[model samples]
Target: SKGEELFTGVVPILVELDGDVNGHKFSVSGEGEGDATYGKLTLKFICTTGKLPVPWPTLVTTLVQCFSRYPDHMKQHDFFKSAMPEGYVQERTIFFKDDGNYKTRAEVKFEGDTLVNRIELKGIDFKEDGNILGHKLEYNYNSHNVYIMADKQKNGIKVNFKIRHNIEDGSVQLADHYQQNTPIGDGPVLLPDNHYLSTQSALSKDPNEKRDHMVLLEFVTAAGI
Candidate 1:
C-alpha cells in the first residue's frame, strides 16, 4: 500500500575528546540521535568541572551556545540514497530553540596555576526530508601567560559538531578537536566534566540541553546503493 519504511540510530557518539591541563585531565563527549528529536534539531556540548574545591566550592563551567534553525533557512544535502531514497535535506519540518547567550565558558584556580575553558565556533545549520545539516569552525590559539586563548587568527579549529551533510566519505576518521594545554579564557578555567553551567555562565555565555548516553554509531550514513 506504500513505500518501504526505515528506522535506525545516528551518531551514537558524534565526537570524543580528551586532554590534560598542567596535571588536571579533562574530557568532552558529543552524541546525536535521528530517531529522537523527531524533526526539530538542537545540539549541545555540556562541559562539567571536576571534583573538590578545598576552601570554597571549586566548580566551574562554560556553555557555548550558537544556533541556525530549520524551515527558516533550508538547503539540499547528500545522503545514502537507500536510507533516504529521494534526499535528506529537502523540506523537512523543524523548529529551532532560541539561545540568547549564543557564544561563551570558565573560572577556577588550582595550586598557583589557573584554569579557564571556553567553547568557540562558527556554525551553519540546514535541513532536508528527515534530518538537519550543520557546518561549524573557529581557529587555533597560543598563550601570552595564563590567558590560553582562541586562535583569534585565520582558518579556524574545525567543526566542533555537525550532522546530516554530504555523506560521501563514511569511514573517514573524525579527529579530536580539544586540547588540555590550550584551554581558552582569561585566567583559570575548568573544562566540562562536572560544574555549575548556569552559575558560571550567569557570569558569562548562554545555555541549554540534556546529555544522555552517546555511542557514535555513524558520523555519516552507510554505503549508498
Candidate 2:
C-alpha cells in the first residue's frame, strides 16, 4: 500500500516533467539540445512517494545507484537538494550509463571550454499536521558557461537555467530535492535573485494540501521538490 501511494503521486510528477517522452511541454526536450534562448524551460515533478517503511539512507543509496543509468544528455533530469562539493562534478556529469565506457554529453570543467559554475541554497525545515508533512524549501542558484556546444550547436554563450526553489512536498513527492544543473558557475544578469524567488506568482499553495503547479514545473526540470 505504501508503495502504491508513492507510485501514484510520483506518476503525476514524471508525466509533468518528461512530457510523454516527447517534446510537447517545452521547446527543447532536453538540456544538450541547444536553443537560441530557453523559454520557460523548467523542471516538472516526475515521481514522488510518501513515507517508506525503509531506511532513508538505504533507499537513497539504491535510488542514487539506479539514477546512475541516466543518459549523458539527461544528466540534468534528476532533481538534487543536498550534495558535497567533492561529489559535485560526479553529480553534474550525467552518464549515458555506468558501463565504464559510457560517454557524457554535458561535462563541467573549469579550465576547458564548457566551464560552468552553479550554486544553490536550501533550508532543512519541516512542518507537519496530522498524517501529512509539509516540506517547504526555498533555494535559488545561477548557471552560466564560458564557451559551450550543445547538440553540436555552438551558442555564443549558453546563459539560462537560473533556478529558484519554492516547493512544498506532501505525501507522494516526486523526489526529495529538486535537482537542477549539477555543475556550479556564475552567469550574466539573466534574472535578479529577487526575480528567481518571486516570479510567476510561484509558491507552494497550501502547506501541503494546496500546491502550486508552477512550482512543480521547477522541481521536475531541475530535480525533485
Q: What lDDT does each candidate get?
A: 0.20, 0.20
What's the C-alpha lDDT at position 141 in model 1?
A: 14
Over 144-195, each residue of candidate 1 has an lDDT whose tens digit, in order, gives 1111122223111112211111222332212212212222223222222111
Model 2 misplaced stretches (Cα beyond 4 Å): 1-38, 51-138, 150-225
Q: Once model 2 is optimally superposed onto the true structure by TM-score, how far is the C-alpha of residue 133 displaced, in angstroms?
A: 18
My TM-score estimates for the predictions, one after another, are 0.20, 0.20
Q: How far is candidate 1 from the true structure (C-alpha RMSD, Å)?
A: 21.6
> Runs in model 1 with CA error above 4 Å?
1-11, 30-68, 76-225
lDDT of 1 at 50: 42
- lDDT by residue (tens digit), candidate 2, 81-135: 1121111232221111111111112222223211122221111121222111222
Model 2, position 199, has a per-residue lDDT of 19
